[PDB]
Amino acid sequence: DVSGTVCLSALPPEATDTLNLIASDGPFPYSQDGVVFQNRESVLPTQSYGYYHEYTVITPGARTRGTRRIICGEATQEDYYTGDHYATFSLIDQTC
Amino acid sequence: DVSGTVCLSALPPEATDTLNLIASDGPFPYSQDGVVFQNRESVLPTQSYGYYHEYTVITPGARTRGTRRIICGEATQEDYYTGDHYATFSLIDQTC
Numbered sequence: 204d205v206s207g208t209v210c211l212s213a214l215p216p217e218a219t220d221t222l223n224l225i226a227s228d229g230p231f232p233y234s235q236d237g238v239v240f241q242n243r244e245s246v247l248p249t250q251s252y253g254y255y256h257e258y259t260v261i262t263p264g265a266r267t268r269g270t271r272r273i274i275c276g277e278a279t280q281e282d283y284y285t286g287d288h289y290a291t292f293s294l295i296d297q298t299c
Numbered sequence: 300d301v302s303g304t305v306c307l308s309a310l311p312p313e314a315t316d317t318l319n320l321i322a323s324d325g326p327f328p329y330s331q332d333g334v335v336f337q338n339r340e341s342v343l344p345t346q347s348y349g350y351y352h353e354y355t356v357i358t359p360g361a362r363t364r365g366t367r368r369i370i371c372g373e374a375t376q377e378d379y380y381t382g383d384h385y386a387t388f389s390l391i392d393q394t395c
């Protein structure tokens with residue numbers, strides 16, 4: 204289930220950077236940015252394989268890629284944020 | 300993010316000295332010159348560990364290494380100046 208919506212302005216600033224890269228189709232910092240997200244635990248609506256893609260949301264200070272990600276769906280503005288490595292997802296509201 | 304491009308001629312003259320040292324591979328005044336800059340805060344573009352190195356820019360009169368540094372990247376002419384101990388960065392243009 205998606206856990207509600209979150210205003211873009213309430214997320215870490217790096218969430219805004221990733222959306223901007225997603226919009227320009229990169230270039231992305233990591234070679235894993237843009238891989239298909241499988242939605243293997245069925246948290247998001249079931250769709251054909253390849254409908255969802257994931258992109259890193261950089262966590263300043265982490266020594267790795269960390270756990271923040273933006274998952275896009277194929278619908279317009281269908282962008283979900285996860286700060287816990289896919290345990291929970293919130294639909295991003297870009298207007299607040 | 301990088302704050303913009305600045306002409307080397309517009310930075311303190313000690314920046315020029317540091318770049319000259321880097322071009323000849325030293326010798327450097329401080330033992331810390333040439334250590335890896337981790338880019339831990341993610342202010343500069345994401346790169347592998349060791350792509351960036353830090354060099355002191357002497358602050359006239361200071362008893363310590365102070366807050367000025369030159370960060371080099373592995374790309375041709377990629378050198379950044381920080382006057383606030385890595386809070387902000389500017390790309391150095393050596394052509395002006």
Ligand SMILES: Nc1nc2c(ncn2[C@@H]2O[C@H](CO)[C@@H](O)[C@H]2OP(=O)(O)O)c(=O)[nH]1
Pocket residue numbers: 235239240241242243244257268272288289
């Ligand atoms: N948990 C989970 N990981 C997925 C899924 N689809 C792709 N992955 C990626 O496969 C890896 C296997 O654990 C995850 O770390 C994640 O890599 P990312 O770190 O790039 O997000 C999915 O549906 N669920």
Ligand SMILES: Nc1nc2c(ncn2[C@@H]2O[C@H](CO)[C@@H](O)[C@H]2OP(=O)(O)O)c(=O)[nH]1
Pocket residue numbers: 331335336337338339340353384385
């Ligand atoms: N803030 C910051 N310091 C770094 C980084 N990489 C190396 N350092 C150096 O590591 C220290 C301890 O964390 C910092 O005070 C700084 O010491 P210098 O002043 O010698 O560069 C980095 O990526 N960020």
